[PDB]
């Protein structure tokens, strides 16, 4: 089997991407944030504290003939941006882009933090990291991908995120029309539960390529590209007037600037992020200070190849017995 679903930016900055997901019988369609950096499928629901719902579409298990309470199971998750959610668990039928999993753990939120409430466009998350990170207790649950895997034509999914435009998540096949040139595959470590890999280096604009190992995660659920302070400083040094601002919370630059591209290595291959992808616009409405899309990972504890990087590529998440990641230009 295969599935194919369109993923759509939630706003004009590509802050995140939503993908329609069918849950239950009859189908309830919720728009979920597919997150290769976490492993819980959780939704706003009829159980979510009323004051913490503001415009989201909710899952109502009582209206699904295939929903069953997973008795005694609870979940609680905290994300790198400090947001969080928690609740209980149902199993139900879940379909993405025509691919159906029966018995999927659907984690129903009783509580969500402010950032989720305030984002009316995101109805929940669908995690696509390794199931070892799933937070359900006392019985850990599998991701949608893990559950689908044995039925898939090939044990893969692909992320093809758009720049200010829709893209695609495919399950079970590689669309050879969706990229240019060849796909370069690179080793993954699952030791931390992430799609963790090692980039071979970077370049800033038209500058020479610096060969250097950068361990990080491929994370569709993080907006920006978070890299070591050395690398980030080298990038922003090429933008007149750019500076790191403690008050704003990262690198800012004059909105009048033209940003250089940033290249990262995948083995001997090179993925080029155009400068425009690195512009996240005024720090506040009407400001002439703009927020940068490449930021330091110092104090995160991990480097993160978030959407800024991933959207410059066609990315294969290969979930074979020995997992790997593939990157192609597009």
From Swiss-Prot:
Q: Which UniProt keywords apply?
A: Aspartyl protease, Disulfide bond, Hydrolase, Protease, Signal, Zymogen
Keyword check for NAD: no
Q: Which cysteines bridge via disulfide bonds?
A: 255-290
User: What processes does the entry annotate via GO biological process terms?
Assistant: proteolysis
Which residues are annotated as active site?
35, 199
Reaction it catalyzes? Hydrolysis of proteins with specificity similar to that of pepsin A, prefers hydrophobic residues at P1 and P1', but does not cleave 14-Ala-|-Leu-15 in the B chain of insulin or Z-Glu-Tyr. Clots milk
Record-annotated Peptidase A1 domain positions: 17-328
Molecular function via GO: aspartic-type endopeptidase activity
> EC number(s) per UniProt?
3.4.23.22
- Presence of keyword Disulfide bond: yes
The family classification in the record reads: Belongs to the peptidase A1 family.
Q: What is the protein's name according to its record? A: Endothiapepsin
List the top taxonomic levels of the source. Eukaryota, Fungi, Dikarya, Ascomycota, Pezizomycotina
Gene name tied to this protein: EAPA
- Entire protein: shown range: 90 to 419 of 419
